[PDB]
Structure 1
Amino acid sequence: SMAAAAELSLLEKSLGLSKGNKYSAQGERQIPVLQTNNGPSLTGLTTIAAHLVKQANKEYLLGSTAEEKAIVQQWLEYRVTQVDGHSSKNDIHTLLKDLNSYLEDKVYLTGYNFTLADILLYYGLHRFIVDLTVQEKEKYLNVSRWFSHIQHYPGIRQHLSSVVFIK
């Protein structure tokens, strides 16, 4: 996995937050911790990510209805339990197959609206997608379409390598 500190730095810049925070790391898993000015400390990649989205006055990225909010959090949890964990380690391809089926009829993870879930899933999948062969990217047609769209979404990709897809 991308180090949490680096991913939060990416997210800050993609959100347009001019002042980068300094994060500490807690426990053996190096879980990120944010100390807040005139607020409590926050622990956890997705927990801090949602807080940053709010700091950027972009709360719409967390979803705009009860359903969309739940779906966003489902995919954030998916990122930190399946993509970052053993599920990806042991069988990246069943994960890609399911994600490919899921994205068959959707532009973004929730549907028609871009959310924090697309950002974090893009950052989390990036190490796997860069390693896919040309044939693998043709097989996972929907993941490739979605990934290609996010990697070109204004301000998201930053320093990360572009992946080549066929249109």
Structure 2
Amino acid sequence: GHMAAAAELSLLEKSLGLSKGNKYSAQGERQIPVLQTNDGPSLMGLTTIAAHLVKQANKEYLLGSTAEEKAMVQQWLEYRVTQVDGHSSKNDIHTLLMDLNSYLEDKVYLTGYNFTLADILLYYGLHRFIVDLTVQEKEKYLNVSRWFCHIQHYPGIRQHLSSVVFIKNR
């Protein structure tokens, strides 16, 4: 299964360069993360908390800088929690990879030329699948490999996660 949300949020804090603290509790059968913010409301949900952390880090630009970019970040965060963490990756990961591969053919990052929170979370969420891909599968999903490679080399993102080997065949 996927990274527990408290583990993923701890990893995200380190990637963002947060110092810090923040304790998370968990609620319900699915162990949904809950943050009690100092002198603020409680926040619930992985991507809700993630967007909050980006703001804590004074890195609001990671949420997008235009209406279009902001909506696209949120679209890809939803894809992360509903498709990658949901049934579709469990039942048919290859259709998900085929679609991402087609999508990323002409894009550096998920929203285009700007790196965002969506790249970070899709990277974290896909790591368990990509780390297990064969040589040939990484060549088949060339555009996913290239994007994943960019993210694993992006400053501060990888943290403790295993580096994946990519070999260009060009």
Please say if residues 9 and 20 of structure 1, whose CA atoms lie closer than 8 Å, have aligned partners that are also in contact.
no
Q: Please, which runs of 5 or more residues in structure 1 have no aligned partner?
A: none
SS of 1:132's partner is coil
Name the residue aligned to 1:37. Answer: 38
CA positional deviation for 1:20: 3.0
SS of 1:38's partner is coil
Question: Residue by residue, what CA displacement relative to the aligned partner does 1:111-153 show, whole Å, maximum 9, x if unpaired?
Answer: 0000000000000000000110000000000000000010011
Q: TM-score, normalised by structure 2?
A: 0.97
Question: Residue by residue, what CA displacement relative to the aligned partner does 1:29-59 show, whole Å, maximum 9, x if unpaired?
Answer: 0000000110000000000000000000000
The whole-number CA distance in structure 1 between the counterparts of 2:42 and 2:14 is 21
Please say if residues 17 and 56 of structure 1, whose CA atoms lie closer than 8 Å, have aligned partners that are also in contact.
yes
SS of 2:26's partner is strand
Please say if residues 23 and 33 of structure 1, whose CA atoms lie closer than 8 Å, have aligned partners that are also in contact.
yes
Question: Residue by residue, what CA displacement relative to the aligned partner does 1:47-96 show, whole Å, maximum 9, x if unpaired?
Answer: 00000000000000000000000000000000000000100000000000
Name the residue aligned to 1:109. Answer: 110
The whole-number CA distance in structure 1 between the counterparts of 2:67 and 2:156 is 27
What do you get for the CA RMSD once the two structures are aligned?
0.5
CA positional deviation for 1:21: 1.1
Please say if residues 62 and 72 of structure 1, whose CA atoms lie closer than 8 Å, have aligned partners that are also in contact.
yes
Q: Please, which runs of 5 or more residues in structure 2 have no aligned partner?
A: none
